[PDB]
Design a protein around this ligand. Sequence first.
Ligand SMILES: [Ca+2]
Ligand SMILES: [Cl-]
Ligand code: NA
Lengths: 52, 234, 4
Amino acid sequence: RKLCSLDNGDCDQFCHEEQNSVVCSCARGYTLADNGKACIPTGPYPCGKQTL
Amino acid sequence: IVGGQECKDGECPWQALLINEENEGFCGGTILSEFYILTAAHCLYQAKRFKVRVGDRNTEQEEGGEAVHEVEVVIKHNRFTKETYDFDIAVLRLKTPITFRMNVAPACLPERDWAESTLMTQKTGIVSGFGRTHEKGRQSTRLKMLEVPYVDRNSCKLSSSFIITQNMFCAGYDTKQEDACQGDSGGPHVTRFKDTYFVTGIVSWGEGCARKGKYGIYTKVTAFLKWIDRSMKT
Amino acid sequence: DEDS
Ligand SMILES: [Ca+2]
Ligand SMILES: [Cl-]
Ligand code: NA
């Protein structure tokens, strides 16, 4: 089983355990990907990313 | 900022600068969203009227990319006290929204429990600002950043002549001459985690700057995540 | 409150 203490539960951003299972989530302005792990920005200046 | 290095263009895009009546910087802030800036309550006492500048890389020349925004509302924590600097937090609601662009982008607010267990257990964070480059020295015309180690609470309390509350944390170095300083208050302490920068602190206070046996003291943002959220609903 |  995945754990938040190991590779952050495979979560890109937030990880927590509910009823003994990993649940990932993301900051505002990101959508959780279909895989339940990755965080996809909803626009061009998502929070927390340096600008290129 | 004492020590550290200049931010490259795009590297510290969440920095804001509070500017006084003479358009001089006196404190920092962190861009949270198009309308909201996080800062320190104590900065509110340091100018009678102020505005917010974003996108600045050189305070002594207009280069393009800067924008100034007037403040609509100041939301100050009602428990802020100069006796201890506890509750050193305020939020600014701008009159006009920030246009995100190169060098102008928000820092993320983290989820509160994960911040405490995962972000605060990272080795280091990044502090930035236009403040003094040495204790009792001059402010920087360039935006500087500095990597600061988290310092454990017990070590920090041992080091400190003043109370460290649960709303504060310590970061920096025992003797290495790197720290935040006057003029940096209110600015970001961010922690990088899997290539995303999260707001973890507010530059708040210290005994001197980069003094031997003293650390920088920061408002603990995790203690105020619900407060910050509510501040955007006045 | 205590967080006002
Ligand atoms: Ca400039
Ligand atoms: Cl703008
Ligand atoms: Na020190």
